[PDB]
Amino acid sequence: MFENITATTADPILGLADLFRADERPGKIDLGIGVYKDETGKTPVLTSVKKAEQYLLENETTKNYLGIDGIPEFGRCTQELLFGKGSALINDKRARTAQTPGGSGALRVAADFLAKNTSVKRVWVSNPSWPNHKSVFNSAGLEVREYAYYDAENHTLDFDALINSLNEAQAGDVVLFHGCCHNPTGIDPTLEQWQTLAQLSVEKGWLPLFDFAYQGFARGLEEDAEGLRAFAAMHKELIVASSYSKNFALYNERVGACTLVAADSETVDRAFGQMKAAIRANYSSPPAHGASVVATILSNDALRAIWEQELTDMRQRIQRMRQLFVNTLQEKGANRDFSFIIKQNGMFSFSGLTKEQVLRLREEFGVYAVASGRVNVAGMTPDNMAPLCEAIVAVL
Amino acid sequence: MFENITATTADPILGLADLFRADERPGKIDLGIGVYKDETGKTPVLTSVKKAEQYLLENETTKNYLGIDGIPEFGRCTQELLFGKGSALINDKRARTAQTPGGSGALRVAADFLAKNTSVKRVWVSNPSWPNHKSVFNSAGLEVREYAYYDAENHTLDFDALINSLNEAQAGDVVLFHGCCHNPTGIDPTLEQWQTLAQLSVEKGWLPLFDFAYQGFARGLEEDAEGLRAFAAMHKELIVASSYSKNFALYNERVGACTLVAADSETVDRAFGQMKAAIRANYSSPPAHGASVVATILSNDALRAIWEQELTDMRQRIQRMRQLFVNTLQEKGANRDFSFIIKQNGMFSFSGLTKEQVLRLREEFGVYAVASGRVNVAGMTPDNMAPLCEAIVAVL
């Protein structure tokens, strides 16, 4: 039964880990998978996280199964983060949250939920998006169509082209929005633009699906949720697939959430039963450790304040790396205007590098980026900035 | 559109948790979800696991993503547990292992892998079986049929009806076997019956899928794997979905493995690339904490020795509860002979209580079993045994 299975090439993003690890050159530089590095070039466990893990070690007395939807406190805390303390959606009990294995697991749960329980047939995704969006939705049995988003020559959001392409989206179609730190472009709608899309989404009867993996990495926790909240103020129905992988530096513990919003409590509760069914037929119930860490931190004032400073510290280091990157490219001999990189939000720079250029970077210089030209700015340090900029200039 | 979603019924197993919790009857007893309890009715963390978690807290320097297939040492240890050290399968590099979120996640990845990459259309499961088997395979669009298994009159394997009922299973159909501790009957094939099934499977061209959620709970680690190893000696291809939930008491950390075996290394590696694609489109990569604990224990001679004894301790307590259960039903005036319970393997008793009797146990006595009459013997205790048995005597 296995003899004729077709070979696959590895993931465009995740395939880099193996390639990177096998490389024997001491000067290799990993600018691939979106993980935060500190000034030492390491990916540390947060101080708040270690303290929470120490608490769990001494205080946990069981590994008994969580409910299919995970830790109740974790749900409450994520709804507050998403919608704002004292939001109508929380007061009116219009939202239900399943803790999931990462933002990824939350996307798949949402896709399975919609495919198996509604008339949804297709999902609209921005032209450049995270490459795994198509795979997740296709695997669930959904068609994916693209909408215009990025102007590659101007390195800007082409809002008019976005609106125009989305006129092909019908009522009952899903449209995927990145909550902030659009991946890979780093370009987000302004508040006014979010408000426009919210209005249009209502008019046209789309179902908004928010992928919210970087809350805290654009401007801040509350500010980064303004887009989602503008949608939430306007819609009866939406779904949010959120992640704590990046904002808690908890990548390998797989901590995310799928939040279902409906017109009222009766409707959301009934629908969430089917979401629970889709989880049950997948991984049964979610992993406790990472989510417990998150709930422990978010529900303790002192710990939360420590974590919030740590997240601010990550955001600010990336911003400093972004400026240093642009300044160093100039010193190393790049002719061209890279000022657009300063305007990008989040971990990445969508650099404009060619497939052949990124291949050269890997092969000749041991600098690893995604073939789309996506580079992880969060993986840049004062120590590796010179060599990576020399490498980029050498392939220009 | 969420108003169009149809009402679900709660899971027949996992649904018990909320119902049991909500019950206000003093002296209520939970015999539902299969978790081990000690003599005082707690579900403790193993001391081996606490020591492992201490080690991790001290030594972990990052939460950086695992690969799609998880921790390499975890995969190695898993294959040794499954097939035995120096197994031909391991030496010929015919097996590949992905760490997954539980045995549940392992079943799901097998299903997704099979549906997308093979001509498998049909999976045969036992009547009765764990109710989530059908759900997981159906999620991938695979037809699930039932084969005869249990002779409930005699409380044995109806082996003739088993053979007859699988007459119709075609070349390229999957047939699912429980490695040991059949859920819910507690009746396993003898080794001769395993060898008979292994031979028939080869003749008929089935693809065996072993669900191995209870290794160690029937007789011991190596003996419990005899059936699997009999199949493995005979087959070019098979899949194993295994779980460390019960044998490490690590339920909520979601610790499992999907192991793929093919005729040779070229084939398994090529097939496994597609298995990774199936994981990527689901939850991307597995949760580190539980699997690291398992790997830490199994790879350290001293820690592993501690764990092995803790496992045989659990097994011993369950066996004492089987005997106490039969004796106490006797003492409390049951006329139905429950001696058959003594010969059942694993955590459960398939008691032969009807759906009406189970409901009355719940409503009248606050005693919670699964509607199939499956009772968790591992949740029985010297203190709860007498009231539990008085309640059963009252409803028969």
Short mmCIF file of C-alpha atoms in Angstrom, two decimals, chain A residues 115-341:
data_model
loop_
_atom_site.label_atom_id
_atom_site.label_comp_id
_atom_site.label_asym_id
_atom_site.label_seq_id
_atom_site.Cartn_x
_atom_site.Cartn_y
_atom_site.Cartn_z
CA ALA A 115 -16.27 21.91 6.61
CA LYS A 116 -18.17 19.33 8.65
CA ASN A 117 -20.93 21.53 10.07
CA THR A 118 -21.76 24.32 7.58
CA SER A 119 -22.15 25.10 3.87
CA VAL A 120 -18.67 26.66 3.80
CA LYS A 121 -16.75 25.53 0.72
CA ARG A 122 -13.95 28.13 0.40
CA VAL A 123 -11.55 30.39 2.29
CA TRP A 124 -10.14 33.64 0.93
CA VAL A 125 -6.49 34.18 1.89
CA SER A 126 -4.18 37.15 1.17
CA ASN A 127 -1.94 36.71 -1.86
CA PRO A 128 1.23 36.44 0.11
CA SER A 129 0.24 34.59 3.23
CA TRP A 130 1.83 31.99 5.48
CA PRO A 131 2.31 28.95 3.19
CA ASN A 132 0.66 26.61 5.69
CA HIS A 133 -2.76 28.33 5.41
CA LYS A 134 -3.49 26.65 2.06
CA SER A 135 -2.39 23.23 3.34
CA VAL A 136 -4.51 23.42 6.50
CA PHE A 137 -7.67 24.51 4.66
CA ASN A 138 -7.20 22.10 1.73
CA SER A 139 -6.64 19.24 4.18
CA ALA A 140 -9.96 20.05 5.83
CA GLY A 141 -11.62 19.85 2.40
CA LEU A 142 -11.95 23.57 1.75
CA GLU A 143 -11.04 25.41 -1.46
CA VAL A 144 -8.70 28.34 -1.10
CA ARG A 145 -8.84 31.46 -3.26
CA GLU A 146 -6.46 34.42 -3.05
CA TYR A 147 -7.26 38.09 -2.63
CA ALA A 148 -4.88 40.90 -3.58
CA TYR A 149 -3.03 42.40 -0.67
CA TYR A 150 0.59 43.31 -1.34
CA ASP A 151 2.09 45.65 -3.91
CA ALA A 152 5.58 44.10 -4.31
CA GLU A 153 7.08 46.99 -6.29
CA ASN A 154 5.99 49.68 -3.84
CA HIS A 155 6.22 47.34 -0.84
CA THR A 156 2.82 48.54 0.34
CA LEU A 157 -0.72 47.34 1.08
CA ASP A 158 -2.76 47.83 -2.10
CA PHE A 159 -6.04 48.50 -0.30
CA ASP A 160 -7.99 49.30 -3.44
CA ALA A 161 -6.87 46.03 -5.09
CA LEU A 162 -7.76 44.15 -1.89
CA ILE A 163 -11.32 45.51 -1.85
CA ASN A 164 -11.73 44.84 -5.56
CA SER A 165 -10.52 41.22 -5.49
CA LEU A 166 -12.79 40.48 -2.49
CA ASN A 167 -15.88 41.42 -4.45
CA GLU A 168 -15.60 37.92 -5.87
CA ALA A 169 -16.13 36.57 -2.33
CA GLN A 170 -19.73 35.47 -1.79
CA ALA A 171 -21.94 35.45 1.30
CA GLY A 172 -21.05 32.38 3.33
CA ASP A 173 -17.41 32.36 2.18
CA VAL A 174 -14.71 32.63 4.82
CA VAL A 175 -12.19 35.45 4.58
CA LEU A 176 -8.96 35.07 6.52
CA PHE A 177 -7.44 38.18 8.14
CA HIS A 178 -4.14 38.32 10.05
CA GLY A 179 -4.87 40.19 13.34
CA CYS A 180 -1.54 42.04 13.23
CA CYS A 181 2.02 41.51 11.93
CA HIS A 182 0.80 40.18 8.57
CA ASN A 183 2.96 37.17 7.61
CA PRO A 184 5.01 37.57 5.46
CA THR A 185 4.62 41.26 4.55
CA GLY A 186 4.67 42.99 7.94
CA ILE A 187 2.00 45.35 6.55
CA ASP A 188 -1.30 45.67 8.45
CA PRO A 189 -4.52 47.58 7.73
CA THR A 190 -4.77 50.89 9.58
CA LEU A 191 -7.66 51.22 12.07
CA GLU A 192 -9.71 53.07 9.43
CA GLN A 193 -9.01 50.31 6.93
CA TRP A 194 -9.97 47.62 9.43
CA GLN A 195 -13.23 49.54 10.04
CA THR A 196 -13.88 49.67 6.29
CA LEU A 197 -13.27 45.91 5.89
CA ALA A 198 -15.50 45.26 8.91
CA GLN A 199 -18.31 47.24 7.26
CA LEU A 200 -17.78 45.52 3.89
CA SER A 201 -17.58 42.10 5.53
CA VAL A 202 -20.97 42.70 7.16
CA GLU A 203 -22.45 43.97 3.89
CA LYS A 204 -21.24 41.03 1.81
CA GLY A 205 -22.00 38.33 4.42
CA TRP A 206 -18.47 36.91 4.74
CA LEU A 207 -17.44 34.88 7.77
CA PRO A 208 -14.27 36.45 9.20
CA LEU A 209 -11.56 34.11 10.37
CA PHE A 210 -8.80 35.88 12.28
CA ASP A 211 -5.35 34.33 12.49
CA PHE A 212 -3.88 36.14 15.50
CA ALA A 213 -0.41 34.68 16.11
CA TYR A 214 1.55 37.87 17.01
CA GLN A 215 -0.57 39.81 19.51
CA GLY A 216 1.87 42.21 21.17
CA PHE A 217 4.48 42.31 18.38
CA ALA A 218 3.20 45.24 16.31
CA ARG A 219 2.43 48.04 18.78
CA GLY A 220 1.18 46.35 21.94
CA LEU A 221 -1.33 43.89 23.38
CA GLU A 222 -4.43 46.11 23.29
CA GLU A 223 -3.49 48.10 20.18
CA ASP A 224 -2.80 44.94 18.16
CA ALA A 225 -6.36 43.75 18.82
CA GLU A 226 -8.07 46.93 17.49
CA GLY A 227 -8.69 45.30 14.09
CA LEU A 228 -10.23 42.19 15.57
CA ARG A 229 -12.32 44.27 18.02
CA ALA A 230 -13.62 46.51 15.22
CA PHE A 231 -14.80 43.32 13.47
CA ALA A 232 -16.23 42.01 16.76
CA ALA A 233 -18.25 45.23 17.22
CA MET A 234 -19.91 44.71 13.80
CA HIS A 235 -20.39 40.97 13.32
CA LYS A 236 -22.75 38.39 14.76
CA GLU A 237 -20.29 35.63 13.80
CA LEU A 238 -16.56 35.16 13.57
CA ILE A 239 -13.75 32.78 14.54
CA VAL A 240 -10.30 33.62 15.96
CA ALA A 241 -7.38 31.19 15.78
CA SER A 242 -4.82 32.67 18.17
CA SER A 243 -1.36 31.59 19.30
CA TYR A 244 0.78 32.06 22.39
CA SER A 245 3.82 30.45 20.71
CA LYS A 246 5.51 33.75 19.94
CA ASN A 247 4.30 36.15 22.67
CA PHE A 248 5.23 33.63 25.42
CA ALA A 249 8.21 32.13 23.51
CA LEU A 250 6.48 28.85 24.17
CA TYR A 251 6.71 27.47 20.58
CA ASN A 252 7.29 23.78 21.33
CA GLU A 253 4.60 23.45 23.97
CA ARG A 254 1.86 24.14 21.37
CA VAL A 255 -0.37 26.70 23.03
CA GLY A 256 -3.15 28.39 21.07
CA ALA A 257 -6.88 28.89 21.02
CA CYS A 258 -9.83 28.63 18.70
CA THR A 259 -12.56 31.07 19.70
CA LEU A 260 -16.03 30.80 18.25
CA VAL A 261 -18.30 33.87 18.28
CA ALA A 262 -22.05 33.71 17.44
CA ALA A 263 -25.11 35.98 17.69
CA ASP A 264 -26.01 34.78 21.19
CA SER A 265 -25.26 32.28 23.97
CA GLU A 266 -27.77 29.69 22.78
CA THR A 267 -26.27 29.69 19.28
CA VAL A 268 -22.61 29.72 20.32
CA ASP A 269 -23.10 26.95 22.90
CA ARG A 270 -24.86 24.70 20.41
CA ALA A 271 -22.27 25.31 17.70
CA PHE A 272 -19.35 24.84 20.13
CA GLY A 273 -20.58 21.30 20.83
CA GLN A 274 -19.74 20.52 17.19
CA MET A 275 -16.37 22.27 17.59
CA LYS A 276 -15.73 19.94 20.53
CA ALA A 277 -16.72 16.99 18.31
CA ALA A 278 -14.19 18.09 15.68
CA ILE A 279 -11.50 18.30 18.37
CA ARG A 280 -12.44 14.90 19.77
CA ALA A 281 -11.98 13.26 16.33
CA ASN A 282 -8.54 14.93 16.06
CA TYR A 283 -6.40 14.88 19.27
CA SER A 284 -9.22 14.39 21.91
CA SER A 285 -8.00 17.10 24.34
CA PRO A 286 -5.18 19.63 24.40
CA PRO A 287 -1.75 19.50 26.14
CA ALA A 288 -1.74 20.95 29.66
CA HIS A 289 1.79 22.22 30.36
CA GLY A 290 2.08 25.21 27.99
CA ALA A 291 -1.50 26.37 28.49
CA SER A 292 -1.17 26.06 32.29
CA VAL A 293 1.93 28.27 32.09
CA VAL A 294 -0.09 30.87 30.15
CA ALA A 295 -3.09 30.75 32.54
CA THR A 296 -0.78 30.86 35.60
CA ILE A 297 0.94 34.00 34.24
CA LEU A 298 -2.13 35.81 32.89
CA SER A 299 -4.17 35.28 36.09
CA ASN A 300 -1.47 36.45 38.53
CA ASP A 301 -0.94 40.27 38.59
CA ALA A 302 2.78 40.20 39.49
CA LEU A 303 3.67 37.44 37.00
CA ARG A 304 1.64 39.08 34.27
CA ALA A 305 3.53 42.34 34.78
CA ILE A 306 6.82 40.49 34.48
CA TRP A 307 5.65 38.77 31.27
CA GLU A 308 4.23 41.98 29.78
CA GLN A 309 7.63 43.68 30.21
CA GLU A 310 9.32 40.63 28.62
CA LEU A 311 7.00 40.90 25.60
CA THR A 312 7.71 44.63 25.35
CA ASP A 313 11.42 43.76 25.49
CA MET A 314 11.06 41.30 22.60
CA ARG A 315 9.08 43.82 20.49
CA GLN A 316 11.63 46.56 21.17
CA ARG A 317 14.67 44.39 20.40
CA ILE A 318 13.13 43.44 17.04
CA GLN A 319 12.50 47.13 16.27
CA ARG A 320 16.12 47.94 17.13
CA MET A 321 17.26 45.04 14.88
CA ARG A 322 15.03 46.37 12.08
CA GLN A 323 16.77 49.80 12.20
CA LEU A 324 20.24 48.21 12.56
CA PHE A 325 19.49 45.96 9.55
CA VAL A 326 18.62 48.92 7.33
CA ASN A 327 21.58 50.95 8.64
CA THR A 328 24.00 48.03 8.15
CA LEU A 329 22.81 47.22 4.60
CA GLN A 330 23.81 50.77 3.64
CA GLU A 331 27.29 50.48 5.24
CA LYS A 332 27.87 47.06 3.57
CA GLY A 333 27.23 48.52 0.12
CA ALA A 334 23.57 47.98 -0.77
CA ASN A 335 22.64 50.71 -3.21
CA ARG A 336 18.97 50.60 -2.75
CA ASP A 337 16.25 52.02 -0.59
CA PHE A 338 15.37 49.58 2.15
CA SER A 339 13.35 52.09 4.19
CA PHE A 340 10.20 49.98 3.66
CA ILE A 341 11.68 47.49 6.08
#
